[PDB]
Amino acid sequence: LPDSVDWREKGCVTEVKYQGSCGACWAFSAVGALEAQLKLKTGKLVTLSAQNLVDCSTEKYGNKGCNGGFMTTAFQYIIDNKGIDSDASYPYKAMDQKCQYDSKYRAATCSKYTELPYGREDVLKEAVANKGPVSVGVDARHPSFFLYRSGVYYEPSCTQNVNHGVLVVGYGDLNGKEYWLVKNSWGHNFGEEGYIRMARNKGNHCGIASFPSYPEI
Ligand SMILES: *[C@H](CS(=O)(=O)c1ccccc1)[C@H](CCc1ccccc1)NC(=O)[C@H](CC(C)C)NC(=O)N1CCOCC1
């Protein structure tokens, strides 16, 4: 495996989105993972509709729109629905709306999704290097995360109880310190232009490898 990978370098990552006051973190983490698979399979990069998931992947999938959801069951909705629209045709409103999915604007499909072994950062590493960006959950309930500016994030108060859905788009080291490159969904003004580098190999820090999954077209 390479010492480091950054999928943004291979044009597999779209621009950082801003969720607003709607807890759709799980939806953004999900489309972000599918967006990279789309590029790898069709050579094209298009941001997919997080609003589609918030409005359509609901109760049946155990999701609650602006009140929370799961990346795994969001993938399941795309597989069931036979597709998901592009962001351009189905824009983000940061609100719970009626499902207005239109197959005419389908921008991608999903055939399956894989769930990785609990707490195994070594397996997450292989997946990120060989498959693509992986959707993960992390404990982001500490002011230090909200206030993150740069560097490798390590919060001694972090726990395994995850509550935020984000996307791991790479890994590497910063003058030797190992980290996971994570795409957040709180706009460009959060952390490093929207990303945060979290501690890697420090005992499943903040639950980073607790609930990981990735889709496949
Ligand atoms: C996204 C996380 S967030 O809102 O960006 C955030 C902000 C600040 C600090 C930490 C996280 C959502 C929030 C859902 C929510 C929770 C409580 C009140 C209102 C909204 N988180 C989720 O969707 C998580 C993601 C998983 C990876 C854990 N799931 C989730 O909250 N639920 C599962 C489905 O039932 C409802 C709760």
What is the per-residue DSSP string for 140-207?
--SHHHHT--SSEE--TT--S---EEEEEEEEEEETTEEEEEEE-SB-TTSTBTTEEEEE-SSSSGGG
Question: Ligand 1 within 6 A of 25 CB?
Answer: yes
Point out the catalytic residue in the list 25, 56, 158, 206: 25
Contact 165, 28 (CB under 8 A): yes
H or E segment at 62? Answer: none
Task: Say what the resolution is, in angstroms.
Answer: 2.0
Beta bridge partners of 15: none
Residue nearest to atom 31 of ligand 1 (CA): 68
Question: Ligand 1 within 6 A of 34 CB?
Answer: no
- Which among 121, 114, 113 is positioned nearest to 138, based on CA atoms? 121
- Six-digit token string for 131: 């498959």
Give me ligand 1 centre to Cα 25, in Å: 7
Coil vs helix vs strand at 46: coil
Coil vs helix vs strand at 34: helix
Give me ligand 1 centre to Cα 95, in Å: 14
Question: Ligand 1 within 6 A of 90 CB?
Answer: no
Question: Ligand 1 within 6 A of 23 CB?
Answer: yes
Cα–Cα dist 36/216, whole Å = 10
Give me ligand 1 centre to Cα 2, in Å: 33
Coil vs helix vs strand at 215: strand
Contact 158, 174 (CB under 8 A): no
Rg (CA), the chain: 16
22, 25, 77, 135: which to mutate for ligand 1, most atoms within 8 A of CB? 25
Residue nearest to atom 32 of ligand 1 (CA): 68
Pairing of strands 106-108, 84-85: antiparallel
Say which CATH class 1-217 falls into: alpha beta
Experimental method: X-ray
Residue nearest to atom 37 of ligand 1 (CA): 68
Contact 208, 180 (CB under 8 A): yes
Instruction: State the burial class of residue 60 (Cβ atoms within 10 Å of its Cβ: 0-12, 13-18, 19+).
Output: exposed
- Which among 116, 47, 121 is positioned nearest to 84, based on CA atoms? 47
Contact 211, 138 (CB under 8 A): no
Identity (one letter) of the amino acid at 153?
Y
- Six-digit token string for 200: 């890697």
